[model samples]
Structure formats: structure tokens, C-alpha cells
Target: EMDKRMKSLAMTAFFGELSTLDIMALIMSIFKRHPNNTIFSVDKDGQFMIDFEYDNYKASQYLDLTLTPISGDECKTHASSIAEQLASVDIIKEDISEYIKTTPRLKRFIKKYRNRS
Candidate 1:
């Protein structure tokens, strides 16, 4: 059940200014990485949320993996930022900078959004 807000957040997040197919791919990739325990959805305010089902002892670890970068950084839309967050949880398999450079949508996003100054 995707809504316009969810779609917008997806676009503003790791999909890196791409199409619905690309956004779906990124969401699927994340779900693949943590299939059983994770859920991706949006809050009432339309913020992205990744919920993890875990025991009390390990809940903090899961939160750290999913929320640390999202909370600490302001530029979640940047390719490098998204790469860092995903790579932190082993969602991505390459160096952050190199990954951003090689990913086509990310490259375009960087060029477009970063050059606005």
C-alpha cells in the first residue's frame, strides 16, 4: 500500500531522484537484507521508518544499524549519505564513494542536487 507521501519520501531517500521502479528496487534490496525482522513504512508525518523485531538485548543494535545515520545526518537524500547508511548495515557491498560514483541514478542526483549552489 503505497501512497503519494511514501513515494515522495522514497524518492527523497535512497532512490536518489529516480523513478518508481528504481525506488522499488532500493526498498526491495533493503527488505532482502533483513527480510524476516524488518519492516519499512512511513509515519503519519511521512518520515521513513524501518522497524525491526528483536529481543530487548539486541534492540539497540538494530536501532543503531537502522536509525543512527538517519537521525544524526541531515542529508539523507545525498547518494554518499545513503551509501554510508546502507553500507553501515551491510546493505551495500562496496566503498561508499565508489558506490555513489558508479550508481547511475546517484550520479545524476549528485550532479543535479549538489550543483544548485
Candidate 2:
């Protein structure tokens, strides 16, 4: 028997496009909002889905995709917004590359760190 039960919903049409950091930012915000075993993924036909699974219950909410920006130029916001959206930003600097590096974004950060010196 599969112990995993999944529930799904689609994000709004506004989420139709995103950059690399855009997705990461949204997920970061969700990590705080749904501290349970929250996970996110996509399916074909442009489905952006998120779920919070814990104690036998799963949940989700509608977010304004265009409101948040982990996007580069930044916006002061457009009256369109998502409440739990601001705390989604960060960095890391360790002897990280000595072990392993997976994401392309991580490599860019290491470059920034070296540049700071």
C-alpha cells in the first residue's frame, strides 16, 4: 500500500512565466508559511502546484504570482501582492564547492562572495 496521498491545485494564469529565482523565491516563502512537510513541483500544461502534508492533512492557497520578486530589477509592488511574501531571500558561503555544487545559482553566489573580498 502506498502511504502517500496527494492533493493538487493549479496556480493562477498570472504565474504563466517565471525566472529561475522567481520559483525559488516562491518556494522559500512557502517553506515559512507551511513549515510542515511542504513540497512543490510542476506538471505539464503549465501547472504550478504546492502542498503541505502533515498529520494526515494537506493544504494550499492562491498567491498573486506577479506580486513577488526574487526577480532582478525589483518592483515596489503594484497593489497586487501576496501577504507572506517578503521573507524569501538569502545566501551561503562555506567551503561549499569543496564538497559539491548543484544549482547554477549557487555558483554565481560563490563568485559574488569572492568578489566581496
Candidate 3:
């Protein structure tokens, strides 16, 4: 038997600039899978936070992410540009995985919503 709310690690702290490209992919993944309160915003301390919830008949899955900024390589694209897309994207921007480098974080996000039976 599994817990009623399936959540992976409890607020893992990732060390990087949490790219918009990566967040975009994860948002799409959750949108297409579960009935979640898809989230994208900066929390109290200005760190970014993301949330997701998935369901499969009897089980309920919940996931949350927060990106604590740290010194890292600079991204060329305007940060707010990607921020704007998530608002109007409406699931239209597909397979952007073609443009950005892979962040294993995306891999972890997908494994939860991508495959379920």
C-alpha cells in the first residue's frame, strides 16, 4: 500500500539557476498529466516555487519545487521572456527540449507525471 499523497523528497535544494527552459518543460508535463494546481512564482524570500498534483484512480500524487538562486553560468535569453511564455503558452510551446540543454531535474519531474498506468 502507498501513502495517500505521494510526494518525492521534501523540498530538495538544487544548486543552479533553474532555467526557464527546464521549468517550461516541467509545467507542460504536469499540465498534460494530472489535475494539479500548476504553479510558477517567486516565494517569500524571492526563491522560485513550482507545484504539481497527479491522480490515478486511487492514488494522489503531489510535487513541489523551489529554486534557490546561486552563482552560475548566465543565460542569454531574458529571464522574464520565458516567464511570459508560461502565462500564454497554453500548452502550445511543445518539444522545446530541442533548444535547451538537459537538466536531470527535468528528468525527475517527468518520471512522476509522464508514465502512469
Candidate 4:
């Protein structure tokens, strides 16, 4: 079912910075492992700007992380949104820290840009 694919992608994006390499690897891995390709296909479409509609699948979720400079509170809001989404989905399997853990460069970048108080 699409549930598995949704969880897989969510888990991957949950614990890592979404790299092109990582996204491709995740996409291929999911398709390889599942072979259904419906969920994976939709994800790939979103990434590649192909024919896809957002918010159609209840399984579909998102992690919107942007690197643009913003206030400390704003950054906190973004992080909180991730957490809230996770909580809302009852999928508290991973946290933002865990996601950042996979990409050290991104972690470092966030640390550098994040406001220190």
C-alpha cells in the first residue's frame, strides 16, 4: 500500500537533509523495495516538477526546510512546524535533530546561521 512508501519517505526526510543524491537514492530504493511505484512516482514528480498534485494523498506529508536567513523566532517556528506535523500524524518516530544528524554540512550551516541566545 501507499502507506509504507509514505512512511519510508517520511522517515528518510525526517532523519536527513534532503539531498539530490539522497532523494534519488531514496526514490530508487523505495521503488526497488516496493515495486508498486505509485507513492514513489508521486514523490519523484514533485521533485522533478512533473505531473503531480499536492494534498491529494492522505499519506503525503512534507518537511519544508529553507536556508534563507531569518530571525531566531522564525527559525524556531519552522522547527516547531516540523515537530507539530510529526505529532499530528502520530509519527513521533523521529525529530528535527535526528534529521539534521544525517547531514553534517547542513547541521553546521544551521548552527552557524541560527541565532544564538
Best-matching candidate per TM-score: 3
What does the lDDT come to for candidate 4? 0.34
- Listed in order, each prediction's TM-score against the native is 0.28, 0.21, 0.31, 0.22
CA-lDDT, candidates in order: 0.39, 0.31, 0.38, 0.34
Where model 3 places Cα greater than 4 Å from the true spot, the runs are 1-6, 10-31, 34-40, 48-92, 96-101, 108-117
TM-score for candidate 3, residues paired by index: 0.31
Candidate 1: C-alpha RMSD to true structure equals 15.1
Q: What is candidate 1's lDDT per residue for 1-117, written digit by digit as tens? A: 233333444445434344322333333333332223543333334344444433332222322223332443334444463444354435333344454566687455445444434
RMSD of each candidate relative to the true structure: 15.1, 16.6, 9.5, 16.6
Stretches of model 2 off by over 4 angstroms after superposition? 1-35, 60-117
lDDT tens digits, residue span 10-52, model 2: 2322233333233333333323222245344232333334333
TM-score of candidate 4 relative to the true fold? 0.22
Clashing pairs in 3: none
Is candidate 3 or 4 superior in lDDT? 3
**Worst ten in a row by lDDT for model 2:** 1-10
Q: Sort by lDDT, best first: what order?
A: 1, 3, 4, 2
Show the colliding residue pairs in model 2.
none
